[PDB]
Design a protein around this nucleic acid. Structure first.
Ligand SMILES: Cc1cn([C@H]2C[C@H](O)[C@@H](COP(=O)(O)OP(=O)(O)OP(=O)(O)O)O2)c(=O)[nH]c1=O
Ligand SMILES: [Ca+2]
Ligand SMILES: [Ca+2]
Ligand SMILES: [Ca+2]
Ligand SMILES: [Ca+2]
Ligand SMILES: [Ca+2]
Ligand SMILES: [Ca+2]
Ligand code: NA
Ligand code: NA
Ligand code: NA
Length: 902
DNA sequence: ACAGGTAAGCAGTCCGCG
DNA sequence: GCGGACTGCTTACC
């Protein structure tokens, strides 16, 4: 097989690499890499190398990387550009691996670990590591085993070995319900003293050193705590054994009081799953505890336990260890579903960067753009500094608040990247400029044609229509990657719906879940089968379908992020190729395109419909349009429509056969107008929304920009079995909204769009009535806690002090002294509840770390002093008053002029 | 340092108000 | 007292 790298580091004049050799084994080598840089030179000295702008350059080879470094400063001290890849690590990879990398993931050692640290004080700061490490569960992907290290003797209590048969038993049987599929994979190792455990762990690590190291929060707690614990005991040179090269870096960020550290283990790629989750999951959770996340992702128990975690070890060491093993498996289960590690490897090896670099799109693209240029024997420009500076983005139509029974939406495929490709925007494809007319003249096709020669943007830029650009080239490649995965995804979604309608005719029997590749649309033979299967087999398929979908989603939504981030990069001063001319060429062309098609779509429906001057496009954002379909339906009337499914099928057909064709002609013209390289402005139907036939449901409404809700029946060709709401911007979608309120608000909306005014009213009267019975946590608000101290002003709120921040301050006063209660971590999120006039806390509200139930010290008090009336008005009614006001309804039946009969 | 702009809602502060 | 203009903060849509 082809050789591929594992980890790479630059240490002095040496580049340490861990790789998998031609045979398939893991090796490690030191290399005094001879790097190269470039200097513009006289054309009289023709050569093989030229920068991206065609100017000739000379290559200088250095005896070692340090000389190449000093040469960069010298050129800087002279005032001349020093071209080429300045991060030698990348150069080394681009050099060592002159080809597309095909890697064997079963060869990459992926380790997952978690540690437990009992602590009487409070959260045991890893900068200190003053408490003993009493448990480590480490899973190795090549061994496929969980290596458990248990400390039986500690100054906080001595316990008996952990029982694997007790652990395996069910909760209901006094066991731990440790997943059966991993019981035979556990390797238990009890230790009599902490030193032996740590020492046995280090040797373990040397034999099976991780290439990729992950876990939940391992970077902020596990890794650091282990480093300083082993360091504060066996000495610092021992602590450095965690690095296959014996070199570590400690980054100190002593945020105000208390000190937090970040340890860098050279020769190792650390992918904290929490960071992988926040970047690739596309979610915004009120809490980020593995417990909360596992629940959200896997829908499993809450790992229940009696006393406080600080005493879990002594009273029930049996469960303590079982819970540590599970937390490790939990992250693994999430990964099998989300597949963020696979994504990371894919990207890392595609770009040829250290794997952990996938957290940085700028470095990811610099590597890509760099390699792609090295091929053509070109020299990348030197990174220059630029001052931060604002620039226009997308256009967003101001919508008319109101309801909208029938609405049809259209969007553009990979907009900004497409625009980049169509216009050929790239650092070296610039041709010049042109006197620009007001953007609205291009929108209205009044302005003279920009260029007859070049590709243009309404922002004034011109690019070559012939020559191709690195940016358009490399971005298109990942776009195709994005396209393949979205196809697999929508297919799996289309299958999920086929199974759902099936779960209506579950022909009783004991059957087998079919053998199918859910990425492809179900064949006719299978569709014919399913219909007979039962809930047993059917449901297993639905689960497998949805797992396949999520998998594709991950792969596609993230290739999207990456390409969209290349556009972003262009507007960020640290990007080697930063340039507001292109960034703006992009966004400006974007604004034109949307408003251009807005005009078209309007002209086309004021004609082949009738009424002229009417505005069909009611809303729009960046690259989308929501076309009111009322008239399209009126044209034919409800008559011919047998059922809901009919007009929906009618609209689909109309959008695909009529709408789009016109729209395609609309952008084909705009393309000529700008004389762009290649037409790539593809706008397809998105949603088909309306209320179920003959119902009082308004089926759709808006309150303003970025705040609407539609009753959708088809989304990009997926015809749901049951109508699915599409809500955006409203409180039901915000993580700051109490769980109970989101559920309630969404239901009020469901009723609004689907059933009617009185349906909405009924539910409102009921929710209000039982509201006070809700669970305190389900109705608490959530917010992040930044700059807690800025307004700390002595335990009491300072000027302009934010509400939630005020809540915190009050909390620290109710636990003031009790250094045993949970603290609020700067940056983390917190639950927030209002307090009625007069309370021992003495303030408007109180706030505590999210995902956790406030400690028993305060709980029963805040539970009493809670202010449901404020919670109900601020969180539920106010927002609701906004939805119905825009919908032109009332959640509460207003007294009528007829309230004198009854 | 380490993708980007656009934009809504809440809550605090200051000010004009018989 | 108390709405309204403006700002700081948070969070969602593209
Ligand atoms: C979601 C998102 C969009 N955008 C911009 C660039 C997008 O091309 C533009 C339109 O957004 P979207 O419509 O969300 O996405 P898209 O056009 O890139 O892709 P598709 O619809 O095919 O899934 O908004 C960002 O810059 N960053 C983001 O994170
Ligand atoms: Ca833990
Ligand atoms: Ca869109
Ligand atoms: Ca789009
Ligand atoms: Ca054209
Ligand atoms: Ca189309
Ligand atoms: Ca689409
Ligand atoms: Na159970
Ligand atoms: Na059936
Ligand atoms: Na007309």
């Amino acid at each position: 097989m082809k050789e591929f790298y594992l980890t790479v580091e630059q240490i002095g004049d040496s580049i340490f690499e861990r790789y998998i050799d031609s045979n398939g084994r893991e090796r490690t080598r030191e290399v005094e890499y001879k790097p190269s840089l470039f200097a513009h030179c006289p054309e009289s000295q023709a050569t093989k190398y030229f920068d991206i702008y065609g100017k000739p350059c000379t290559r200088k080879l250095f005896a070692n990387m340090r000389d190449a470094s000093q040469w960069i400063k010298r050129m800087e001290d002279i005032g001349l550009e020093a071209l080429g890849m300045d991060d030698f690590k990348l150069a080394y990879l681009s050099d060592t691996y002159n080809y597309e990398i095909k890697y064997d993931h079963t060869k990459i050692r992926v380790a997952n670990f978690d540690i437990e640290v009992t602590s009487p004080d409070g959260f045991p700061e890893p900068s200190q590591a003053k408490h003993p490490i009493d448990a480590i569960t480490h899973y190795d992907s090549i061994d496929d085993r969980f290596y458990v290290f248990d400390l039986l003797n500690s100054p906080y209590g001595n316990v008996e070995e952990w029982s694997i048969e007790i652990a395996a038993k069910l909760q209901e049987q006094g066991g731990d319900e440790v997943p059966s599929e991993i019981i035979d994979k556990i390797i238990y190792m009890p230790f009599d003293n902490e030193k032996e455990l740590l020492m046995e762990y280090l040797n373990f690590w040397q034999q099976k050193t991780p290439v990729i190291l992950t876990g939940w929060n391992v970077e902020s707690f596990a890794i650091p705590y282990v480093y300083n614990r082993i360091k504060n005991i066996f000495g610092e040179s021992t602590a450095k054994r965690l690095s296959p090269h014996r070199k570590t870096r400690v980054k100190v960020i002593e945020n105000m009081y208390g000190s937090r550290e970040i340890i860098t283990l050279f020769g190792i790629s650390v992918l904290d799953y929490i960071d992988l989750y926040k970047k690739f999951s596309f979610t915004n959770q009120p809490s980020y505890s593995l417990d909360y996340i596992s629940e959200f992702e896997l829908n499993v128990g809450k790992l229940k336990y009696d006393g406080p975690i600080s005493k879990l070890r002594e009273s029930n060491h049996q469960r303590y260890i079982s819970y540590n093993i599970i937390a490790v498996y939990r992250v693994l289960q999430i990964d099998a579903k989300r597949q963020f590690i696979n994504l990371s490897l894919d990207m890392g090896y595609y770009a040829k960067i250290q794997i952990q670099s996938v957290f940085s799109p700028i470095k990811t693209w610099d590597a890509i753009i760099f390699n792609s240029l090295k091929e053509q024997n070109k020299v990348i420009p030197q990174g220059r500094s630029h001052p931060v500076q604002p620039y226009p983005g997308a256009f967003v139509k101001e919508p008319i608040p109101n309801r909208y029974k029938y609405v049809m939406s259209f969007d553009l495929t990979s907009f900004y990247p497409s625009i980049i490709r169509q216009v050929n925007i790239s650092p070296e494809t610039i041709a010049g400029t042109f006197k620009v007319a007001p953007l609205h003249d291009y929108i209205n096709a009044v302005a003279e044609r920009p260029s007859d020669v070049y590709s243009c943007s309404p922002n004034g830029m011109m690019y070559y229509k012939d020559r191709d650009g690195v940016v358009p080239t490399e971005i298109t490649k990942v776009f195709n990657q994005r396209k393949e995965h979205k196809g697999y995804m929508l297919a799996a979604q289309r299958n999920g719906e086929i199974i759902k309608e099936a779960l209506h005719n579950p022909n009783l029997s004991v059957d087998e879940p079919l053998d199918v590749d859910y990425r492809f649309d179900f064949s006719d033979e299978i569709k014919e089968k399913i219909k007979k299967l039962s809930a047993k087999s059917l449901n297993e398929m639905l689960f497998r379908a949805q797992r396949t979908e999520v998998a594709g989603m991950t792969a596609q939504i993230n290739r999207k992020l990456l390409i969209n981030s290349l556009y972003g990069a262009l507007g960020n001063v640290w990007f080697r190729y930063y340039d507001l001319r292109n960034a703006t060429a992009i966004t400006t062309f974007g604004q034109m395109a949307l408003q251009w098609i807005e005009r078209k779509v309007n002209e086309y429906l004021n004609e082949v419909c009738g009424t002229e001057g009417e505005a069909f496009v009611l809303y729009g954002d960046t690259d989308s349009i929501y076309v009111s379909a009322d008239k399209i339906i009126d044209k034919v009337g409800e008559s011919k429509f047998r059922d809901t499914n009919h007009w929906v099928d009618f609209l689909d057909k109309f959008a695909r056969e009529r709408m789009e064709p016109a729209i395609d002609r609309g952008f084909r013209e705009m393309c000529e107008y700008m004389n762009n390289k290649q037409h790539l402005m593809f706008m397809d139907r998105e949603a088909i929304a309306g209320p179920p036939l003959g119902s009082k449901g308004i089926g759709g409404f808006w309150t303003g920009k970025k705040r609407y809700a539609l009753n959708v029946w088809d989304m990009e060709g997926t015809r749901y079995a049951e109508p699915k709401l599409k809500i955006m911007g409203l409180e039901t979608q915000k993580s700051s909204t109490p769980k109970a309120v989101q559920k309630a608000l969404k239901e009020c909306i469901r009723r609004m769009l689907q059933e009617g005014e009185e349906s909405l009213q009924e539910y409102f009267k009921e929710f209000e009535k039982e509201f006070r019975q809700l669970n305190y946590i389900s109705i608490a608000s959530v917010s992040s806690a930044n700059n807690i101290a800025k307004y700390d002003v002595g335990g009491f709120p300072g000027p302009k002090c934010p509400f939630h921040i005020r809540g915190i301050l009050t909390y620290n006063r109710a636990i003031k002294g009790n250094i045993d209660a949970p603290q609020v971590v700067e940056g983390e999120k917190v639950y927030v509840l209002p307090l009625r006039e007069g309370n021992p806390f003495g303030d408007k509200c109180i706030a505590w770390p999210s995902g956790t139930e406030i400690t028993d010290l305060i709980k029963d008090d805040v539970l009493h002093w809670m202010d449901y009336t404020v919670l109900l008005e601020k969180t539920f009614i106010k927002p609701l008053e906004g939805f119905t006001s825009a919908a032109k309804l009332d959640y509460e039946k207003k007294a009528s002029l007829f309230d004198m009969f009854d």
